Amino acid sequence: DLGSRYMDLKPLGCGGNGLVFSAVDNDCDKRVAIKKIVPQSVKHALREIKIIRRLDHDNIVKVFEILGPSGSQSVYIVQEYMETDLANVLEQGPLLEEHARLFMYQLLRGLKYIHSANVLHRDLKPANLFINTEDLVLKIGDFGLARIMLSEGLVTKWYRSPRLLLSPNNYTKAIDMWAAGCIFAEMLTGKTLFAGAHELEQMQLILESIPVVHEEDRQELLSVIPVYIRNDMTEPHKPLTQLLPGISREAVDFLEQILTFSPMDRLTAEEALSHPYMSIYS
Ligand SMILES: CN1CCC(n2cc(Nc3ncc4nnn(-c5ccc(F)cc5C#N)c4n3)cn2)CC1
């Protein structure tokens, strides 16, 4: 019951920072999502506020207000209420190719925007992608958004690129592109593309399906895991076509251009939108 504006406070879940509540705005009779934030946390909240406050795109969750002691402009981030998240949608099964393709287009539009603003998403995963099922609108959650320049066991590693498994602190625009490809594959199958228990099993799963076409990358992998490194890494044992058996050639071909081992062969959000597979939303 914090403030006179935000009534009927009901929990929605838990973010990587704090709790999320669902509340009704008293000014306009429309629902909002409020993030409560409980030092090193003070510096981390200051950066997050400055960024998300200046971003406004159709595929980025809208941030309405920044509050503190009960409606004063701990911190409270008031943002738009979305019907559900992608994780919830995919728990009910895979999507029709037309829906996976439409959400991928929106995800890429949202990424092209934040990348253009030199912001990246450090935690791109289906739980951070919000959906309004009637409108078929996908929006990228604000938590995780950062400038390009405790509870560790609870952070998801399944959408991490091979480069991010090898250099865990270095974040780039390309790492978001890998996660976008993993999310697309998951929308089509309903299953996690690479579901490794630890960083070692993860890399082994990717290496079973993704070709290593550069000697620099193969030399780097030979130092980390010599046993599962062959002389010809150009031909995986279980390629992407085998991991997505029911889905179309067009979709697998597009995904093969995103799920590249090296960030230098990978399509940027802008290049992926220009690809004939995405360019169909004129
Ligand atoms: C457990 N499962 C049940 C369904 C649930 N759900 C969430 C919404 N709407 C909604 N709209 C705008 C939001 N902005 N942040 N955020 C979050 C909500 C929960 C959370 F953990 C992290 C974030 C973050 N960032 C938002 N949720 C509708 N249903 C998701 C969690």
PDB file of C-alpha atoms and ligand atoms in Angstrom:
ATOM      1  CA  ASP A   1       0.000   0.000   0.000  1.00  0.00           C
ATOM      2  CA  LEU A   2       3.023   2.320  -0.724  1.00  0.00           C
ATOM      3  CA  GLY A   3       1.634   5.737  -1.741  1.00  0.00           C
ATOM      4  CA  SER A   4      -1.893   6.934  -2.702  1.00  0.00           C
ATOM      5  CA  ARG A   5      -1.285   6.294  -6.456  1.00  0.00           C
ATOM      6  CA  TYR A   6      -0.293   2.611  -6.451  1.00  0.00           C
ATOM      7  CA  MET A   7      -3.019   0.330  -4.977  1.00  0.00           C
ATOM      8  CA  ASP A   8      -3.602  -3.488  -4.908  1.00  0.00           C
ATOM      9  CA  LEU A   9       0.128  -4.482  -4.638  1.00  0.00           C
ATOM     10  CA  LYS A  10       0.384  -8.185  -5.704  1.00  0.00           C
ATOM     11  CA  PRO A  11       3.744 -10.046  -6.394  1.00  0.00           C
ATOM     12  CA  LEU A  12       4.679 -11.074  -9.980  1.00  0.00           C
ATOM     13  CA  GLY A  13       7.996 -12.856  -9.388  1.00  0.00           C
ATOM     14  CA  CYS A  14      11.665 -12.227  -8.580  1.00  0.00           C
ATOM     15  CA  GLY A  15      14.269 -10.442 -10.681  1.00  0.00           C
ATOM     16  CA  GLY A  16      18.039 -10.789 -10.257  1.00  0.00           C
ATOM     17  CA  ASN A  17      17.994  -7.562  -8.134  1.00  0.00           C
ATOM     18  CA  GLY A  18      14.675  -7.456  -6.189  1.00  0.00           C
ATOM     19  CA  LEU A  19      10.966  -8.378  -6.045  1.00  0.00           C
ATOM     20  CA  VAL A  20       8.426  -7.322  -8.728  1.00  0.00           C
ATOM     21  CA  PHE A  21       4.848  -6.327  -7.824  1.00  0.00           C
ATOM     22  CA  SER A  22       1.682  -5.817  -9.874  1.00  0.00           C
ATOM     23  CA  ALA A  23      -0.341  -2.699  -8.997  1.00  0.00           C
ATOM     24  CA  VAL A  24      -3.160  -0.512 -10.342  1.00  0.00           C
ATOM     25  CA  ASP A  25      -2.348   3.180 -11.065  1.00  0.00           C
ATOM     26  CA  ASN A  26      -5.083   5.395  -9.387  1.00  0.00           C
ATOM     27  CA  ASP A  27      -4.559   8.365 -11.805  1.00  0.00           C
ATOM     28  CA  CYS A  28      -5.407   6.303 -14.961  1.00  0.00           C
ATOM     29  CA  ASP A  29      -7.297   2.980 -14.395  1.00  0.00           C
ATOM     30  CA  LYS A  30      -4.467   0.847 -15.901  1.00  0.00           C
ATOM     31  CA  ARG A  31      -2.079  -1.706 -14.394  1.00  0.00           C
ATOM     32  CA  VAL A  32       1.705  -1.254 -13.766  1.00  0.00           C
ATOM     33  CA  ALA A  33       4.712  -3.429 -12.771  1.00  0.00           C
ATOM     34  CA  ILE A  34       6.851  -2.003  -9.857  1.00  0.00           C
ATOM     35  CA  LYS A  35      10.465  -3.113  -9.065  1.00  0.00           C
ATOM     36  CA  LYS A  36      11.600  -2.615  -5.419  1.00  0.00           C
ATOM     37  CA  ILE A  37      15.416  -2.281  -4.916  1.00  0.00           C
ATOM     38  CA  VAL A  38      17.112  -2.791  -1.500  1.00  0.00           C
ATOM     39  CA  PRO A  39      26.742   0.487  -0.989  1.00  0.00           C
ATOM     40  CA  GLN A  40      27.794  -1.326  -4.242  1.00  0.00           C
ATOM     41  CA  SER A  41      24.018  -1.632  -4.973  1.00  0.00           C
ATOM     42  CA  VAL A  42      23.762   2.241  -4.836  1.00  0.00           C
ATOM     43  CA  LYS A  43      26.343   2.635  -7.655  1.00  0.00           C
ATOM     44  CA  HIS A  44      24.671  -0.213  -9.675  1.00  0.00           C
ATOM     45  CA  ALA A  45      21.172   1.372  -9.337  1.00  0.00           C
ATOM     46  CA  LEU A  46      22.495   4.852 -10.345  1.00  0.00           C
ATOM     47  CA  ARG A  47      23.853   3.513 -13.698  1.00  0.00           C
ATOM     48  CA  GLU A  48      20.625   1.499 -14.398  1.00  0.00           C
ATOM     49  CA  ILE A  49      18.407   4.597 -13.725  1.00  0.00           C
ATOM     50  CA  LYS A  50      20.382   6.972 -16.097  1.00  0.00           C
ATOM     51  CA  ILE A  51      20.292   4.457 -19.036  1.00  0.00           C
ATOM     52  CA  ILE A  52      16.609   3.120 -18.972  1.00  0.00           C
ATOM     53  CA  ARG A  53      15.308   6.691 -18.365  1.00  0.00           C
ATOM     54  CA  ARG A  54      16.544   7.864 -21.818  1.00  0.00           C
ATOM     55  CA  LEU A  55      15.437   4.763 -23.855  1.00  0.00           C
ATOM     56  CA  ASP A  56      12.053   4.773 -25.664  1.00  0.00           C
ATOM     57  CA  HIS A  57      11.281   2.060 -28.199  1.00  0.00           C
ATOM     58  CA  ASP A  58       8.254  -0.103 -29.036  1.00  0.00           C
ATOM     59  CA  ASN A  59      10.142  -3.317 -28.105  1.00  0.00           C
ATOM     60  CA  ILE A  60      11.673  -2.061 -24.828  1.00  0.00           C
ATOM     61  CA  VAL A  61       9.464  -2.214 -21.679  1.00  0.00           C
ATOM     62  CA  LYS A  62       8.469   1.411 -20.845  1.00  0.00           C
ATOM     63  CA  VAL A  63       9.757   2.904 -17.548  1.00  0.00           C
ATOM     64  CA  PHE A  64       7.178   5.409 -16.199  1.00  0.00           C
ATOM     65  CA  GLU A  65       8.603   6.681 -12.878  1.00  0.00           C
ATOM     66  CA  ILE A  66      11.516   6.415 -10.402  1.00  0.00           C
ATOM     67  CA  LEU A  67      10.278   6.551  -6.778  1.00  0.00           C
ATOM     68  CA  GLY A  68      11.787   6.160  -3.286  1.00  0.00           C
ATOM     69  CA  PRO A  69      10.095   6.798   0.085  1.00  0.00           C
ATOM     70  CA  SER A  70       6.430   5.991  -0.864  1.00  0.00           C
ATOM     71  CA  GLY A  71       5.798   7.894  -4.141  1.00  0.00           C
ATOM     72  CA  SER A  72       8.759  10.338  -4.045  1.00  0.00           C
ATOM     73  CA  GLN A  73      10.451  11.207  -7.414  1.00  0.00           C
ATOM     74  CA  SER A  74      14.917   1.847  -1.131  1.00  0.00           C
ATOM     75  CA  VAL A  75      13.999   2.656  -4.815  1.00  0.00           C
ATOM     76  CA  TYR A  76      10.825   1.812  -6.808  1.00  0.00           C
ATOM     77  CA  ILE A  77      10.849   1.513 -10.624  1.00  0.00           C
ATOM     78  CA  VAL A  78       7.313   1.881 -12.085  1.00  0.00           C
ATOM     79  CA  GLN A  79       7.057   0.324 -15.553  1.00  0.00           C
ATOM     80  CA  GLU A  80       4.378  -0.922 -18.002  1.00  0.00           C
ATOM     81  CA  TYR A  81       2.559  -4.147 -17.106  1.00  0.00           C
ATOM     82  CA  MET A  82       2.971  -6.880 -19.727  1.00  0.00           C
ATOM     83  CA  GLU A  83       0.542  -9.804 -19.853  1.00  0.00           C
ATOM     84  CA  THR A  84       3.255 -12.512 -19.498  1.00  0.00           C
ATOM     85  CA  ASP A  85       6.854 -13.502 -20.275  1.00  0.00           C
ATOM     86  CA  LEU A  86       8.288 -15.721 -23.036  1.00  0.00           C
ATOM     87  CA  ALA A  87       9.309 -18.412 -20.521  1.00  0.00           C
ATOM     88  CA  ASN A  88       5.663 -18.808 -19.553  1.00  0.00           C
ATOM     89  CA  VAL A  89       4.481 -18.923 -23.209  1.00  0.00           C
ATOM     90  CA  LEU A  90       7.028 -21.620 -24.228  1.00  0.00           C
ATOM     91  CA  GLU A  91       6.247 -23.816 -21.129  1.00  0.00           C
ATOM     92  CA  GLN A  92       2.935 -24.526 -22.953  1.00  0.00           C
ATOM     93  CA  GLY A  93       4.857 -25.685 -26.045  1.00  0.00           C
ATOM     94  CA  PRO A  94       6.627 -24.507 -29.201  1.00  0.00           C
ATOM     95  CA  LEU A  95       5.255 -21.619 -31.243  1.00  0.00           C
ATOM     96  CA  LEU A  96       3.989 -21.643 -34.838  1.00  0.00           C
ATOM     97  CA  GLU A  97       6.856 -20.613 -37.147  1.00  0.00           C
ATOM     98  CA  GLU A  98       4.903 -17.391 -37.994  1.00  0.00           C
ATOM     99  CA  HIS A  99       4.824 -16.430 -34.288  1.00  0.00           C
ATOM    100  CA  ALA A 100       8.483 -17.341 -33.594  1.00  0.00           C
ATOM    101  CA  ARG A 101       9.498 -15.270 -36.675  1.00  0.00           C
ATOM    102  CA  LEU A 102       7.307 -12.262 -35.602  1.00  0.00           C
ATOM    103  CA  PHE A 103       8.804 -12.318 -32.029  1.00  0.00           C
ATOM    104  CA  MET A 104      12.343 -12.716 -33.428  1.00  0.00           C
ATOM    105  CA  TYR A 105      11.751  -9.636 -35.639  1.00  0.00           C
ATOM    106  CA  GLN A 106      10.603  -7.611 -32.548  1.00  0.00           C
ATOM    107  CA  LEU A 107      13.515  -8.926 -30.452  1.00  0.00           C
ATOM    108  CA  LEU A 108      15.943  -7.846 -33.244  1.00  0.00           C
ATOM    109  CA  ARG A 109      14.266  -4.406 -33.569  1.00  0.00           C
ATOM    110  CA  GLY A 110      14.690  -3.904 -29.779  1.00  0.00           C
ATOM    111  CA  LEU A 111      18.355  -5.014 -29.985  1.00  0.00           C
ATOM    112  CA  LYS A 112      19.165  -2.824 -33.033  1.00  0.00           C
ATOM    113  CA  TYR A 113      17.809   0.131 -30.965  1.00  0.00           C
ATOM    114  CA  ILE A 114      19.713  -0.429 -27.714  1.00  0.00           C
ATOM    115  CA  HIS A 115      22.942  -1.318 -29.618  1.00  0.00           C
ATOM    116  CA  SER A 116      22.588   1.988 -31.555  1.00  0.00           C
ATOM    117  CA  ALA A 117      22.491   3.738 -28.094  1.00  0.00           C
ATOM    118  CA  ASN A 118      25.677   1.768 -27.026  1.00  0.00           C
ATOM    119  CA  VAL A 119      23.592  -0.201 -24.485  1.00  0.00           C
ATOM    120  CA  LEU A 120      23.597  -4.019 -24.393  1.00  0.00           C
ATOM    121  CA  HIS A 121      21.451  -6.599 -22.505  1.00  0.00           C
ATOM    122  CA  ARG A 122      23.644  -8.554 -20.103  1.00  0.00           C
ATOM    123  CA  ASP A 123      20.908 -11.174 -19.352  1.00  0.00           C
ATOM    124  CA  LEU A 124      18.920 -11.927 -22.534  1.00  0.00           C
ATOM    125  CA  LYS A 125      16.728 -15.024 -21.881  1.00  0.00           C
ATOM    126  CA  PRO A 126      12.949 -15.820 -22.329  1.00  0.00           C
ATOM    127  CA  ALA A 127      12.097 -14.744 -18.711  1.00  0.00           C
ATOM    128  CA  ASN A 128      13.356 -11.194 -19.657  1.00  0.00           C
ATOM    129  CA  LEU A 129      11.206 -10.987 -22.807  1.00  0.00           C
ATOM    130  CA  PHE A 130       7.662  -9.817 -22.112  1.00  0.00           C
ATOM    131  CA  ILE A 131       4.605 -10.581 -24.266  1.00  0.00           C
ATOM    132  CA  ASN A 132       1.136  -9.076 -24.753  1.00  0.00           C
ATOM    133  CA  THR A 133      -0.468 -12.164 -26.315  1.00  0.00           C
ATOM    134  CA  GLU A 134      -3.490 -10.373 -27.880  1.00  0.00           C
ATOM    135  CA  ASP A 135      -1.375  -7.746 -29.699  1.00  0.00           C
ATOM    136  CA  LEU A 136       1.522 -10.275 -30.272  1.00  0.00           C
ATOM    137  CA  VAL A 137       3.971  -7.651 -29.005  1.00  0.00           C
ATOM    138  CA  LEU A 138       7.335  -8.604 -27.574  1.00  0.00           C
ATOM    139  CA  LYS A 139       9.213  -6.160 -25.340  1.00  0.00           C
ATOM    140  CA  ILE A 140      12.727  -6.460 -23.833  1.00  0.00           C
ATOM    141  CA  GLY A 141      12.873  -6.095 -20.034  1.00  0.00           C
ATOM    142  CA  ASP A 142      14.881  -3.107 -18.625  1.00  0.00           C
ATOM    143  CA  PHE A 143      16.780  -5.144 -15.936  1.00  0.00           C
ATOM    144  CA  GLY A 144      20.123  -6.213 -17.405  1.00  0.00           C
ATOM    145  CA  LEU A 145      20.488  -3.183 -19.751  1.00  0.00           C
ATOM    146  CA  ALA A 146      24.037  -1.732 -19.471  1.00  0.00           C
ATOM    147  CA  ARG A 147      26.505   0.632 -21.304  1.00  0.00           C
ATOM    148  CA  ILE A 148      28.985  -1.366 -23.454  1.00  0.00           C
ATOM    149  CA  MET A 149      31.905   0.458 -21.641  1.00  0.00           C
ATOM    150  CA  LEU A 150      25.681 -13.351  -4.412  1.00  0.00           C
ATOM    151  CA  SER A 151      23.001 -15.558  -6.151  1.00  0.00           C
ATOM    152  CA  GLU A 152      25.569 -16.601  -8.811  1.00  0.00           C
ATOM    153  CA  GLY A 153      24.057 -20.126  -8.860  1.00  0.00           C
ATOM    154  CA  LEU A 154      20.744 -18.532  -9.906  1.00  0.00           C
ATOM    155  CA  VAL A 155      22.134 -16.902 -13.116  1.00  0.00           C
ATOM    156  CA  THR A 156      21.189 -18.753 -16.341  1.00  0.00           C
ATOM    157  CA  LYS A 157      24.170 -19.885 -18.500  1.00  0.00           C
ATOM    158  CA  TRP A 158      22.200 -21.529 -21.429  1.00  0.00           C
ATOM    159  CA  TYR A 159      22.154 -18.361 -23.653  1.00  0.00           C
ATOM    160  CA  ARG A 160      25.855 -17.579 -23.253  1.00  0.00           C
ATOM    161  CA  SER A 161      27.993 -17.519 -26.384  1.00  0.00           C
ATOM    162  CA  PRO A 162      31.180 -19.646 -26.676  1.00  0.00           C
ATOM    163  CA  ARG A 163      33.237 -16.382 -26.329  1.00  0.00           C
ATOM    164  CA  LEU A 164      31.348 -15.545 -23.091  1.00  0.00           C
ATOM    165  CA  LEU A 165      31.988 -19.118 -21.754  1.00  0.00           C
ATOM    166  CA  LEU A 166      35.751 -18.534 -22.495  1.00  0.00           C
ATOM    167  CA  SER A 167      35.925 -14.866 -21.252  1.00  0.00           C
ATOM    168  CA  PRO A 168      33.123 -14.618 -18.603  1.00  0.00           C
ATOM    169  CA  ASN A 169      33.331 -10.841 -17.952  1.00  0.00           C
ATOM    170  CA  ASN A 170      33.633  -9.388 -21.471  1.00  0.00           C
ATOM    171  CA  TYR A 171      30.211  -8.215 -22.791  1.00  0.00           C
ATOM    172  CA  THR A 172      29.586  -7.166 -26.459  1.00  0.00           C
ATOM    173  CA  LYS A 173      26.705  -6.551 -28.922  1.00  0.00           C
ATOM    174  CA  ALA A 174      27.575  -9.959 -30.498  1.00  0.00           C
ATOM    175  CA  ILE A 175      26.880 -11.847 -27.210  1.00  0.00           C
ATOM    176  CA  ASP A 176      23.217 -10.533 -27.364  1.00  0.00           C
ATOM    177  CA  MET A 177      23.016 -11.836 -30.971  1.00  0.00           C
ATOM    178  CA  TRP A 178      24.013 -15.351 -29.821  1.00  0.00           C
ATOM    179  CA  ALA A 179      21.341 -15.293 -27.055  1.00  0.00           C
ATOM    180  CA  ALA A 180      18.732 -14.037 -29.693  1.00  0.00           C
ATOM    181  CA  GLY A 181      19.575 -17.098 -31.891  1.00  0.00           C
ATOM    182  CA  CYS A 182      19.181 -19.458 -28.872  1.00  0.00           C
ATOM    183  CA  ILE A 183      15.856 -17.835 -28.028  1.00  0.00           C
ATOM    184  CA  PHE A 184      14.622 -18.157 -31.657  1.00  0.00           C
ATOM    185  CA  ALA A 185      15.580 -21.919 -31.735  1.00  0.00           C
ATOM    186  CA  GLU A 186      13.736 -22.342 -28.380  1.00  0.00           C
ATOM    187  CA  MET A 187      10.611 -20.575 -29.753  1.00  0.00           C
ATOM    188  CA  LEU A 188      10.549 -23.095 -32.665  1.00  0.00           C
ATOM    189  CA  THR A 189      11.152 -26.268 -30.603  1.00  0.00           C
ATOM    190  CA  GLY A 190       9.881 -25.300 -27.139  1.00  0.00           C
ATOM    191  CA  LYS A 191      13.186 -26.847 -25.811  1.00  0.00           C
ATOM    192  CA  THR A 192      16.443 -25.098 -24.693  1.00  0.00           C
ATOM    193  CA  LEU A 193      18.905 -25.368 -27.595  1.00  0.00           C
ATOM    194  CA  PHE A 194      22.055 -25.931 -25.457  1.00  0.00           C
ATOM    195  CA  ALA A 195      21.189 -27.075 -21.897  1.00  0.00           C
ATOM    196  CA  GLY A 196      24.564 -27.680 -20.205  1.00  0.00           C
ATOM    197  CA  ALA A 197      24.806 -28.114 -16.397  1.00  0.00           C
ATOM    198  CA  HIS A 198      28.188 -26.254 -16.245  1.00  0.00           C
ATOM    199  CA  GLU A 199      30.423 -24.174 -18.609  1.00  0.00           C
ATOM    200  CA  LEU A 200      32.318 -27.392 -19.734  1.00  0.00           C
ATOM    201  CA  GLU A 201      29.130 -29.357 -20.721  1.00  0.00           C
ATOM    202  CA  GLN A 202      27.783 -26.164 -22.423  1.00  0.00           C
ATOM    203  CA  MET A 203      30.864 -25.770 -24.648  1.00  0.00           C
ATOM    204  CA  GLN A 204      30.785 -29.541 -25.487  1.00  0.00           C
ATOM    205  CA  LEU A 205      27.081 -29.178 -26.536  1.00  0.00           C
ATOM    206  CA  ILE A 206      27.806 -26.144 -28.758  1.00  0.00           C
ATOM    207  CA  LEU A 207      30.926 -27.897 -30.302  1.00  0.00           C
ATOM    208  CA  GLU A 208      28.734 -30.912 -31.205  1.00  0.00           C
ATOM    209  CA  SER A 209      26.593 -28.626 -33.437  1.00  0.00           C
ATOM    210  CA  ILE A 210      28.471 -25.384 -34.324  1.00  0.00           C
ATOM    211  CA  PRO A 211      31.449 -25.400 -36.744  1.00  0.00           C
ATOM    212  CA  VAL A 212      34.762 -23.774 -35.702  1.00  0.00           C
ATOM    213  CA  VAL A 213      36.002 -22.199 -38.976  1.00  0.00           C
ATOM    214  CA  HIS A 214      38.910 -20.046 -37.659  1.00  0.00           C
ATOM    215  CA  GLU A 215      42.293 -21.478 -36.548  1.00  0.00           C
ATOM    216  CA  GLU A 216      42.527 -18.705 -33.844  1.00  0.00           C
ATOM    217  CA  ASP A 217      39.293 -20.151 -32.244  1.00  0.00           C
ATOM    218  CA  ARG A 218      40.500 -23.797 -32.630  1.00  0.00           C
ATOM    219  CA  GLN A 219      43.919 -22.893 -31.051  1.00  0.00           C
ATOM    220  CA  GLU A 220      42.062 -21.254 -28.128  1.00  0.00           C
ATOM    221  CA  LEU A 221      39.833 -24.360 -27.652  1.00  0.00           C
ATOM    222  CA  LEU A 222      42.893 -26.715 -27.810  1.00  0.00           C
ATOM    223  CA  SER A 223      44.294 -25.020 -24.654  1.00  0.00           C
ATOM    224  CA  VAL A 224      40.993 -25.201 -22.722  1.00  0.00           C
ATOM    225  CA  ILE A 225      39.646 -28.684 -23.796  1.00  0.00           C
ATOM    226  CA  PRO A 226      42.162 -30.759 -25.882  1.00  0.00           C
ATOM    227  CA  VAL A 227      40.210 -34.129 -25.877  1.00  0.00           C
ATOM    228  CA  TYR A 228      36.997 -32.936 -27.683  1.00  0.00           C
ATOM    229  CA  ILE A 229      39.090 -30.896 -30.248  1.00  0.00           C
ATOM    230  CA  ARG A 230      39.553 -32.650 -33.630  1.00  0.00           C
ATOM    231  CA  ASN A 231      41.761 -31.533 -36.583  1.00  0.00           C
ATOM    232  CA  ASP A 232      38.578 -30.750 -38.669  1.00  0.00           C
ATOM    233  CA  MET A 233      36.068 -28.736 -36.567  1.00  0.00           C
ATOM    234  CA  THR A 234      34.386 -27.453 -39.813  1.00  0.00           C
ATOM    235  CA  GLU A 235      31.943 -30.441 -39.756  1.00  0.00           C
ATOM    236  CA  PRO A 236      29.980 -30.906 -36.441  1.00  0.00           C
ATOM    237  CA  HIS A 237      28.766 -34.387 -35.318  1.00  0.00           C
ATOM    238  CA  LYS A 238      25.136 -33.223 -34.818  1.00  0.00           C
ATOM    239  CA  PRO A 239      24.510 -30.058 -36.990  1.00  0.00           C
ATOM    240  CA  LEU A 240      21.670 -27.453 -36.382  1.00  0.00           C
ATOM    241  CA  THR A 241      19.396 -29.230 -38.925  1.00  0.00           C
ATOM    242  CA  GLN A 242      19.436 -32.349 -36.612  1.00  0.00           C
ATOM    243  CA  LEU A 243      18.643 -30.223 -33.494  1.00  0.00           C
ATOM    244  CA  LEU A 244      15.615 -28.586 -35.193  1.00  0.00           C
ATOM    245  CA  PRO A 245      14.136 -31.556 -37.164  1.00  0.00           C
ATOM    246  CA  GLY A 246      10.531 -30.426 -37.812  1.00  0.00           C
ATOM    247  CA  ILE A 247      11.273 -26.719 -38.572  1.00  0.00           C
ATOM    248  CA  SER A 248      11.847 -25.182 -42.107  1.00  0.00           C
ATOM    249  CA  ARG A 249      15.108 -24.892 -44.122  1.00  0.00           C
ATOM    250  CA  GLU A 250      14.601 -21.070 -44.290  1.00  0.00           C
ATOM    251  CA  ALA A 251      14.556 -20.747 -40.499  1.00  0.00           C
ATOM    252  CA  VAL A 252      17.553 -23.115 -39.944  1.00  0.00           C
ATOM    253  CA  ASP A 253      19.555 -21.254 -42.629  1.00  0.00           C
ATOM    254  CA  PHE A 254      18.827 -17.904 -40.938  1.00  0.00           C
ATOM    255  CA  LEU A 255      19.771 -19.352 -37.511  1.00  0.00           C
ATOM    256  CA  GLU A 256      23.053 -20.842 -38.949  1.00  0.00           C
ATOM    257  CA  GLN A 257      24.043 -17.191 -39.740  1.00  0.00           C
ATOM    258  CA  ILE A 258      23.491 -16.125 -36.066  1.00  0.00           C
ATOM    259  CA  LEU A 259      24.743 -19.226 -34.241  1.00  0.00           C
ATOM    260  CA  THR A 260      28.315 -18.877 -35.543  1.00  0.00           C
ATOM    261  CA  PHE A 261      31.162 -19.704 -33.132  1.00  0.00           C
ATOM    262  CA  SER A 262      33.023 -16.447 -33.946  1.00  0.00           C
ATOM    263  CA  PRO A 263      31.410 -13.015 -33.305  1.00  0.00           C
ATOM    264  CA  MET A 264      33.125 -11.773 -36.550  1.00  0.00           C
ATOM    265  CA  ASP A 265      31.020 -14.066 -38.817  1.00  0.00           C
ATOM    266  CA  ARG A 266      27.822 -13.466 -36.813  1.00  0.00           C
ATOM    267  CA  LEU A 267      25.075 -11.173 -38.147  1.00  0.00           C
ATOM    268  CA  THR A 268      24.506  -7.936 -36.224  1.00  0.00           C
ATOM    269  CA  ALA A 269      20.894  -7.070 -35.208  1.00  0.00           C
ATOM    270  CA  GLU A 270      20.830  -4.627 -38.201  1.00  0.00           C
ATOM    271  CA  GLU A 271      22.169  -7.311 -40.666  1.00  0.00           C
ATOM    272  CA  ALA A 272      19.704  -9.950 -39.344  1.00  0.00           C
ATOM    273  CA  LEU A 273      16.782  -7.484 -39.958  1.00  0.00           C
ATOM    274  CA  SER A 274      17.996  -6.907 -43.519  1.00  0.00           C
ATOM    275  CA  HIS A 275      18.145 -10.713 -44.114  1.00  0.00           C
ATOM    276  CA  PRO A 276      15.324 -11.788 -46.552  1.00  0.00           C
ATOM    277  CA  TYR A 277      13.899 -14.018 -43.765  1.00  0.00           C
ATOM    278  CA  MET A 278      13.209 -10.875 -41.561  1.00  0.00           C
ATOM    279  CA  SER A 279      12.848  -8.191 -44.272  1.00  0.00           C
ATOM    280  CA  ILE A 280       9.196  -9.623 -44.980  1.00  0.00           C
ATOM    281  CA  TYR A 281       7.744  -7.214 -42.313  1.00  0.00           C
ATOM    282  CA  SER A 282       7.894  -4.325 -44.883  1.00  0.00           C
TER     283      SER A 282
HETATM  284  C1  LIG B   1       6.932 -16.492 -12.409  1.00  0.00           C
HETATM  285  N1  LIG B   1       6.461 -15.766 -13.597  1.00  0.00           N
HETATM  286  C2  LIG B   1       4.978 -15.665 -13.581  1.00  0.00           C
HETATM  287  C3  LIG B   1       4.435 -14.724 -14.670  1.00  0.00           C
HETATM  288  C4  LIG B   1       5.177 -13.378 -14.531  1.00  0.00           C
HETATM  289  N2  LIG B   1       4.554 -12.217 -15.204  1.00  0.00           N
HETATM  290  C5  LIG B   1       5.111 -10.975 -15.354  1.00  0.00           C
HETATM  291  C6  LIG B   1       4.203 -10.186 -15.979  1.00  0.00           C
HETATM  292  N3  LIG B   1       4.297  -8.836 -16.366  1.00  0.00           N
HETATM  293  C7  LIG B   1       5.381  -7.995 -16.284  1.00  0.00           C
HETATM  294  N4  LIG B   1       5.287  -6.823 -16.912  1.00  0.00           N
HETATM  295  C8  LIG B   1       6.288  -5.951 -16.888  1.00  0.00           C
HETATM  296  C9  LIG B   1       7.475  -6.281 -16.211  1.00  0.00           C
HETATM  297  N5  LIG B   1       8.658  -5.653 -16.011  1.00  0.00           N
HETATM  298  N6  LIG B   1       9.429  -6.394 -15.292  1.00  0.00           N
HETATM  299  N7  LIG B   1       8.795  -7.619 -14.988  1.00  0.00           N
HETATM  300  C10 LIG B   1       9.320  -8.704 -14.239  1.00  0.00           C
HETATM  301  C11 LIG B   1       8.415  -9.560 -13.582  1.00  0.00           C
HETATM  302  C12 LIG B   1       8.842 -10.657 -12.856  1.00  0.00           C
HETATM  303  C13 LIG B   1      10.202 -10.922 -12.770  1.00  0.00           C
HETATM  304  F1  LIG B   1      10.598 -11.996 -12.079  1.00  0.00           F
HETATM  305  C14 LIG B   1      11.140 -10.112 -13.393  1.00  0.00           C
HETATM  306  C15 LIG B   1      10.722  -8.994 -14.155  1.00  0.00           C
HETATM  307  C16 LIG B   1      11.751  -8.199 -14.801  1.00  0.00           C
HETATM  308  N8  LIG B   1      12.574  -7.578 -15.301  1.00  0.00           N
HETATM  309  C17 LIG B   1       7.538  -7.533 -15.557  1.00  0.00           C
HETATM  310  N9  LIG B   1       6.469  -8.333 -15.603  1.00  0.00           N
HETATM  311  C18 LIG B   1       3.053 -10.965 -16.171  1.00  0.00           C
HETATM  312  N10 LIG B   1       3.247 -12.166 -15.705  1.00  0.00           N
HETATM  313  C19 LIG B   1       6.676 -13.562 -14.808  1.00  0.00           C
HETATM  314  C20 LIG B   1       7.212 -14.487 -13.701  1.00  0.00           C
END
